[PDB]
Amino acid sequence: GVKNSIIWFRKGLRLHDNPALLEACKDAKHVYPVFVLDPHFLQQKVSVNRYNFLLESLEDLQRSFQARGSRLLVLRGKPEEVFPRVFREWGVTQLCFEHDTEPYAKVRDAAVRRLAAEAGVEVVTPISHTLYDTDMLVARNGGAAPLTMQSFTKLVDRVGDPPAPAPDPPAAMPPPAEDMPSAAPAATGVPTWQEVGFKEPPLTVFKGGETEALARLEAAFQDPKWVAGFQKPDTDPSAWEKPATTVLSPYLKFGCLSARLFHARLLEVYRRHPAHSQPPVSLRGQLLWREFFYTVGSTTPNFHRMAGNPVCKQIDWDDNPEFLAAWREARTGFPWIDAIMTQLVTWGWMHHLARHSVACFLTRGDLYVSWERGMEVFEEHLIDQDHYLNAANWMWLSASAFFSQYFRVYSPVVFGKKYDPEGRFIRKFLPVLKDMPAKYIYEPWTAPLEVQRKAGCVVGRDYPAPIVDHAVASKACIARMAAAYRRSK
């Protein structure tokens, strides 16, 4: 005779702009904030940087629910086995969670709705992870998703502004009922990275949580001139003391920051700065790139692979395990490439143009290894790893989809020199080259043997030689891509 609701967290790890949380609290007697954790996830993939980022995001929710008289419940096990138990135990009448469009999510969410229907539980799945209803944009475009960014911008302009961010939850929330067995604090607490099974500590400098996301949002909007005149291709990839972009991707991935709140703050600045940048280079355009890849990926089968993907090109990539290990272990011999790969495993985040260099080097630029193999490396270490975004950009850099200018090959020796001629980005993440003069910091093998010894870095003993000559490798990759683009017909 009362409303007992469950707000199930998967993504959307936040309290602001959470329509699923608001519906769960309205006229609610008891609310159960639940996150389902599988304690056998490492026993099957995931770096300690991203998994601890998720754990720090749950601790942020825990302090937020406790300040409002509630408590976050971290249930162990699988959703299909735990929810039918807590439905009858807690007397649940309504289940609410943010809508997700990932392939594993749809199969998972379909089974839970079945279990909730057999238990008489109402299911409310509002859309708040993306800007718009991605299925509505497909219907408004005649039934198919746009394939070009120019056509996608014309579509979202006809639809209009995204929905406004939902209001904040009340200051006090209905707490979970007391003395419930499955709600015992000893078995529902937030674990640490040592308990889950990781043996190495995290090395990233980015802390998870809604509070840190909101702090990074305000820090970016403290200069409205910088937000308005933001142009993505003009940012600095070598900037590490202060990254050239917002670095809000790990918070938008886990849902620690609402994309609609991000978009709402952008329009406030744009209406006071009439000369603000326009898509696709604007800051608003970057959210559209996220929205554009989500719209195509959710409606494209096998979007994360090559075979069976209707939008990906069937290129005869090489199966070279030696080039993959050198690229994965950051021992390619090119300091600009090895520094970005060291930043991948240390911070779990790199600048967009920095990810352009290593993705072009592995695929259509030098090694000609499949973008699927490098995507497996990024998904392991990137703390902002997004299923649809990591794929469409790996297909962009490999010239398999969306992008088609394979004659444009980044140079692993000159690309980084234009931003950082002294190699400050290289000496930080590759301290073995910290005494190397700037004349040979990007090409250490060209330095004389007297200079290599005087800097404590002899090429071939302390730092590896380049695995390939870029001129020989790039000209070979470009010609093979041309033959690939001629067999497409």
From the list ligand FAD, Cl ion, none, which binds 336 (C-beta under 5 to 8 Å, kind-based)?
A: none
Q: Report if residue 401 touches ligand FAD, rule: CB under 6 A.
A: no
> Does 390 appear as a known binding residue?
yes
- The window from 10-18, 55-63, 166-174, 384-392 that contacts ligand FAD (CB under 6 A) reads 384-392
Q: Which is nearer to ligand FAD, 116 or 131 (CB)?
A: 131
CA 211 to chain centre: 18
Nearer to ligand FAD, 399 or 433 (CB): 399
Name the residue with tokens 């980005």. Answer: 425
Specify the DSSP class assigned to residue 102: S
- Examine residue 280 and say whether the peptide bond preceding it is cis (omega within 30 degrees of 0): yes
288 is in an annotated binding site: yes
Q: Which is nearer to Cl ion, 209 or 416 (CB)?
A: 416
Supply the minimum distance, in Å, between the C-beta of residue 390 and ligand FAD: 3
Q: Which two tokens stand for residue 155?
A: 């579509």
Instruction: Determine the interface stretch with ligand FAD among 20-28, 86-94, 185-193, 349-357 (rule: CB under 6 A).
Output: 349-357
User: Please, which of residues 264-323 interact with ligand FAD by CB under 6 A?
Assistant: 286-287, 289-290, 293
Say which entry of ligand FAD, Cl ion, none residue 311 contacts (CB below 5 to 8 A, set by partner kind): none
Determine phi and psi for 37, rounding to 5 degrees: -115, 130
**What is the spatial distance between Cα 152 and Cα 150, in angstroms, rounded to a whole number?**
5
Segment (H or E) for 250: helix 249-253
* Binding site residues, Cl ion, CB under 5 A: 410-411, 415
Annotated binding-site residue? 129:
no
- For residue 386, state whether it binds ligand FAD (rule: CB under 6 A): yes
Query: Does residue 232 bind ligand FAD (CB under 6 A)?
Result: yes
User: Does residue 246 belong to the site contacting ligand FAD (CB under 6 A)?
Assistant: yes
Binding partner selected for residue 397 from Cl ion, ligand FAD, none, CB under the kind-specific 5 to 8 Å limit: ligand FAD
Q: Which amino acid is at 351?
A: H
Least Å distance, CB 488 to ligand FAD, is 22
Binding site annotation covers 203?
no
Task: Report residue 405 as tokens.
Answer: 């200018």
Q: Any binding-site annotation on 338?
A: no
DSSP of 343-380: HHHHHS---HHHHHHHHHIIIIITT-B-HHHHHHHHHH
- Tokens 């790039």 locate to 474
**How far is the CA of 315 from the CAs of 6, 22, 107, in angstroms?**
47, 48, 30
Q: Which does 293 bind (CB under 5 to 8 A by kind): Cl ion, ligand FAD, none?
A: ligand FAD
Q: Check the annotation: does 328 bind a ligand.
A: no
Q: Per CB under 6 A, does 389 bind ligand FAD?
A: yes
Determine the interface stretch with ligand FAD among 50-58, 315-323, 383-391, 462-470 (rule: CB under 6 A).
383-391
Helix 352-360 / helix 335-347 crossing angle, nearest 10 deg: 120
161 a known binding residue? no
Tell whether 287 is in a known binding site. yes
Element (H, E) at 298: helix 283-298
Smallest gap from Cβ 413 to Cl ion, in A, equals 9
Residue 390 in the binding site for ligand FAD (CB under 6 A): yes
Q: How far is the CB of 126 from ligand FAD (least distance, A)?
A: 20
Alpha-carbon span 290 to 206, nearest angstrom: 21
Amino acid identity of residue 160, one-letter, is G
| Nearer CB in complex with Cl ion: 396/410 | 410
318 DSSP 8-state letter: B
Burial class (CB in 10 A: 0-12, 13-18, 19+), 120: exposed
In the three-class reduction of DSSP (H, G, I as helix; E, B as strand; rest coil), residue 96 is classed as: strand
Using CB under 6 A as the binding rule, whether residue 32 contacts ligand FAD is answered as no
Give the count of residues interacting with ligand FAD (CB under 6 A): 28
Q: How near is the Cβ of 442 to ligand FAD at its closest, in Å?
A: 21
Q: Does 382 bind ligand FAD (CB under 6 A)?
A: yes
Look at residue 412 and give its three-state secondary structure: coil
Q: CA 288: distance to chain centroid? A: 15
Residue 355 marked ligand-binding: yes
Among 5, 282, 363, 393, binds ligand FAD (CB under 6 A): 393
- 138 neighbors 299 (Cβ within 8 angstroms): yes
Cβ-Cβ contacts under 8 Å for 409 (sequence gap 6 or more):
360, 364, 365, 474, 477, 478
Residues making up the annotated binding site for FAD are 232, 245-249, 286-293, 349, 352, 355, 384-386, 390, 393
Binding site for ligand FAD (CB under 6 A): 232, 245-249, 252-253, 286-287, 289-290, 293, 351-352, 355-356, 359, 378, 382, 384-386, 389-390, 393-394, 397
